[PDB]
């Protein structure tokens, strides 16, 4: 059942699998009869967020002489047509944003280009191309197997969590939890 998997996150913690250290898993978008929409697959690309912007028709951005960029990740095989930007509350702008929670706003169409470039630009934002859709009700059973570590994301906990800097924060949110994922007991 589960009272809406939206605003929740699951602690997978991959062994490695292409990714090395630069952010792994964030949250579940929603939970519907048609399936469970979330970005927890983890699959980074060799393309950068500013790379695609400047390459297309957003040439005049503000990367300055730093030249450094942020890599864009694929959120899943579904909705690959659109890049989803998750950001926090900033000022009182809002044109094309979908409510994940009160502070967390999902912007993908147009509005994001309006956001950054002015003083109403969100402090922090993450971009993912597409999203993943899990089988209807399946994830619920998988979590019941204790194969997935389920924890809620209390608004600020999702995007800020104390707000300063964090790595492995998702695993720390519970209190450094291990076991129940890597068992290595296949043939037995």
From Swiss-Prot:
GO-annotated cellular components: cytosol
InterPro entries: AlgH-like
Cross-referenced Pfam families: DUF179
Source superkingdom: Bacteria
Signal peptide feature range: none
PANTHER family: UNCHARACTERIZED PROTEIN YQGE, UPF0301 PROTEIN YQGE
Protein family membership: Belongs to the UPF0301 (AlgH) family.
Name the UniProt record assigns to this protein: UPF0301 protein HD_1794
Lineage start: Bacteria, Pseudomonadati, Pseudomonadota, Gammaproteobacteria, Pasteurellales
